[PDB]
Design a protein around this ligand. Structure first.
Ligand SMILES: [Mg+2]
Ligand SMILES: [Mg+2]
Length: 807
RNA sequence: UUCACAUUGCCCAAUU
RNA sequence: ACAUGUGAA
């Protein structure tokens, strides 16, 4: 379970395409640089405050130490210099004042950039991490002070334009920046981005925006408890500033107006306090005060003397309208984004950055050219009379004149309509039934007759007794179609009951899609229905599959989904699916709740054991090979994850049978990186968005210098700029060639049963996502006693276990 | 809750 | 994910 396998070869399959990547070559000197350890007492202050401390510590202690040396700082404890500092080894206490801190500098090490060159070439097997870290600290030292750092990105108010969102928020533009080793050179990965920020405005104006006032004096009355509570929820936690210089965090909003609100000086009011001490009379005395600092003390500031501090990211969720405006502001086609990144890099002036130039680094201002190959799509085989073969074109095909490979005859089914009768009439339901049966017969999934049961219902409470009744009354019941009036808790209840309480197949459909049907929608609905009932929609043309299918092989997809920002004990959800036939088409699912924000799948061995057992029951084969697509592990966790999960896989094998030792291939799938690929030639641009065509593959130039990784953009780019999926092979007993693995991955992107399209990641990974999503629905408002309760929540019924209920 | 693609959390990141 | 867009037999 040690080091990732070396790249075995380069891919040769498919026609070439000229591409540009948002990677900008770096020239790094062949020079040793110097790494010093810093400790700033006390180390509780924000990273930025530390950065300032060091920043003018260097200014204040210029004479003795640095002497024209321009150090870079990571913001916490790491300092780097281009040539060695005068303090030969010895920790030195330094005294720094801020307009109070002791800073100790001690030598740590030498970082050789020559060793980095050696790693980029053949000579070193590994890329020296410390070196990359050093370069990264160098490159982001200045913009960490100039701009507002968010993660690996930087944001700023765009000078000359405003993009308000309302509610005191506006769009800030910026960019992601990262330093990456490559087959060719050190690369600077730069992408543009945008995010909502709080406006740097007076608090009075903030109040007006949040409470929807065109101006204050609507009214000159204290706010209603409603208004005050909304304002409270909006400003709580934000930083404000005064002029009397002072910055505070807002912990509350007083109930009383400033004229009435009092504190112990003897009881003294806030307004009067400002009159007496600060010679100020409140223009808006009827308004509340912000409570700032510790909520235990009693420090209360009037609204009209405070400003919202500049550069605070808006953490809180945006409204629907705010979001709409955000999208509208930041939407760019592929060529537009390409031009924006290029414009940004020409206007960046990285090479005049005094710290960059101090470390002798040069950055290229043009995107790297890279040659991709466009893989051929697999043929898709259908069934019926035709045995039709479909040929994807630009990552899309369709169901017209085709029947499912194996279509289910639906004989017994029901309809529960939770939409109101007056809006979703019996005529609507009838007409919808007619249409659905037409499309379904065309597809080889004949709904033989009318539903056996069709009643209206209201509220979540009616779900369980209705479903119990159905299961007890109609023998051979295959499906319940559930019509919903849009967003409702009923959906989650329908799933809790069907999936985990009764083990019944349900298909939900929104009221509006019953009222107005279209062939495309009903067709997609049929994809879902056929799968849920155990059917096989289509299969990869068998003779067109890579040689790996010549022996029994199981395809696993795995994902962990974590709770959103904020809520803190809500668990993470681990989901693993495995193929159950040779096509591969049918999948079974396993799911677990696990520790909050843990990425490592804790219970993997038990899950894989289950899947292996089910695979044997379905196919009567034991897999000689296990292909494991693992979604969403970042590089910094590669070793962590691979160590636990690979072993878990082995354990599942070992405990199942000895000496059962199938070859394992462990592939990390990453859809959330910042690598963008653009057509160099305009006539290669596909559709309105002008993206690279589906099947575009890149395994040279910008990829890893020694390891086995590649980009594959398997999908049609409909809108904006495509995200090409990245695949990183952490382990491979099966000794794949690049060609076979890339082609296999591509083909798996065509087995996804919910649409006749090639999807952005292989089917097993996608299914993993759907399973986790469904689990999250089983857990809504539910968050060993506790953990057992949550584990119970996501446990499907016995009859649901062997199904694709997640489709 | 027909579906994909894209933006986006979340892993890794980040003295009144 | 939700939310928001763009689309489809
Ligand atoms: Mg995940
Ligand atoms: Mg949506």
């Amino acid at each position: 379970a040690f080091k990732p396998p070396p790249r075995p070869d380069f891919g040769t399959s498919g026609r070439t395409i000229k591409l540009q990547a948002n990677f900008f070559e770096m020239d790094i000197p062949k020079i040793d640089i110097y790494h010093y350890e810093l400790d700033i007492k006390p180390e509780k202050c924000p990273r930025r405050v530390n950065r300032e401390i060091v920043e003018h510590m260097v200014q204040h202690f210029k004479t003795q130490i640095f002497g024209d040396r321009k150090p870079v700082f990571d913001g916490r404890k790491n300092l780097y210099t281009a040539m060695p500092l005068p303090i030969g080894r010895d920790k030195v206490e330094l005294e720094v004042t801020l307009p109070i801190f002791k800073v100790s500098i001690k030598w740590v090490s030498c970082v050789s950039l020559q060793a980095l060159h050696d790693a980029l070439s053949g000579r070193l097997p590994s890329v020296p991490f410390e070196t990359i870290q050093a370069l990264d600290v160098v490159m982001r030292h200045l913009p960490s002070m100039r701009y507002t750092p968010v993660g690996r990105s930087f944001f700023t108010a765009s000078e000359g334009c405003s993009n308000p969102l309302g509610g005191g928020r506006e769009v800030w533009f910026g960019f992601h920046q990262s330093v990456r080793p490559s087959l060719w050179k050190m690369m600077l990965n730069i992408d543009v981005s945008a995010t909502a920020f709080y406006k740097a405005q007076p608090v009075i104006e903030f109040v007006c925006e949040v409470l929807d006032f065109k101006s204050i004096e609507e009214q000159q009355k204290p706010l209603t408890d409603s208004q005050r509570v909304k304002f409270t929820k909006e400003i709580k936690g934000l930083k404000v500033e005064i002029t009397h210089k002072r910055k505070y965090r807002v912990c509350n909003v007083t109930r009383r107006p400033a004229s009435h609100q009092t504190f112990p000086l003897v009881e003294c009011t806030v307004a009067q306090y400002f009159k007496d001490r600060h010679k100020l009379v409140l223009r808006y005395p009827h308004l509340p005060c912000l409570q700032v600092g510790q909520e235990q003390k009693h420090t209360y500031l009037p609204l009209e003397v405070c400003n919202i501090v500049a550069g605070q990211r808006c953490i809180k969720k945006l409204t629907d309208n705010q979001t709409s405006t955000m999208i509208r502001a930041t939407a760019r086609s592929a060529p537009d984004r390409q031009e924006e990144i290029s414009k940004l890099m020409r206007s960046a002036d990285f090479n005049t950055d005094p710290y960059v130039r101090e470390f002798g680094i040069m950055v290229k201002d043009e995107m790297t050219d890279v040659t991709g190959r466009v893989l051929q799509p697999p043929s898709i085989l259908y069934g019926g009379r035709n045995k039709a073969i479909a040929t994807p074109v630009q990552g899309v095909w369709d169901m017209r004149n085709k029947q499912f490979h194996t279509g289910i005859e639906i004989k017994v089914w029901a309809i529960a309509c939770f939409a109101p009768q007056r809006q979703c009439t019996e005529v609507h339901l009838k007409s919808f039934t007619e249409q659905l049966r037409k499309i379904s017969r065309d597809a080889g999934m004949p709904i033989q007759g009318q539903p056996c049961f069709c009643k209206y219902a209201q509220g979540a409470d009616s779900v369980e007794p209705m479903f119990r009744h159905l299961k007890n009354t109609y023998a051979g019941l295959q499906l319940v179609v559930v019509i919903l009036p849009g967003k409702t808790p009923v959906y989650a209840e329908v799933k809790r009951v069907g999936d985990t309480v009764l083990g019944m197949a349900t298909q939900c459909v929104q009221m509006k899609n019953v009222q107005r049907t279209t062939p495309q929608t009903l067709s997609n609905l049929c994809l879902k229905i056929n799968v849920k009932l155990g059917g096989v929609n289509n299969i990869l043309l068998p003779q067109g599959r890579p040689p790996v299918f010549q022996q029994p092989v199981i395809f696993l997809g795995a994902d962990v989904t974590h709770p959103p920002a904020g809520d803190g004990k809500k668990p993470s959800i681990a989901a693993v699916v495995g193929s159950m036939d040779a096509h591969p088409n049918r999948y079974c699912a396993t799911v677990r709740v696990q520790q909050h924000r843990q990425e490592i799948i804790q219970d993997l061995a038990a899950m894989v054991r289950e899947l292996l057992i089910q695979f044997y029951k379905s196919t009567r084969f034991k897999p000689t090979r296990i292909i494991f697509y693992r979604d969403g592990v970042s590089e910094g966790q590669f070793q962590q994850v691979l160590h636990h999960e690979l072993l878990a896989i082995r354990e599942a094998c070992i405990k199942l049978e000895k000496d059962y030792q199938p070859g394992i291939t462990f592939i990390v799938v990453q859809k959330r990186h910042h690598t963008r690929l653009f057509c160099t030639d305009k006539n290669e641009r596909v559709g309105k968005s002008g993206n690279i065509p589906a099947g575009t593959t890149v395994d040279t130039k910008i990829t890893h210098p020694t390891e086995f990784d590649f980009y594959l953009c398997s999908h049609a780019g409909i809108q904006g700029t495509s995200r090409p999926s990245h695949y990183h092979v952490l382990w491979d007993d099966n000794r794949f060639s690049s060609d076979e693995l890339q082609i296999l991955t591509y083909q798996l992107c065509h087995t996804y049963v919910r649409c006749t399209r090639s999807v952005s990641i292989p089917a097993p990974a996608y299914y993993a996502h759907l399973v986790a999503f469904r689990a999250r629905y089983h857990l809504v408002d539910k968050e060993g006693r506790d953990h057992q309760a949550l584990a119970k929540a996501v446990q499907v019924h016995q009859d649901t276990l062997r199904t694709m209920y997640f489709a």
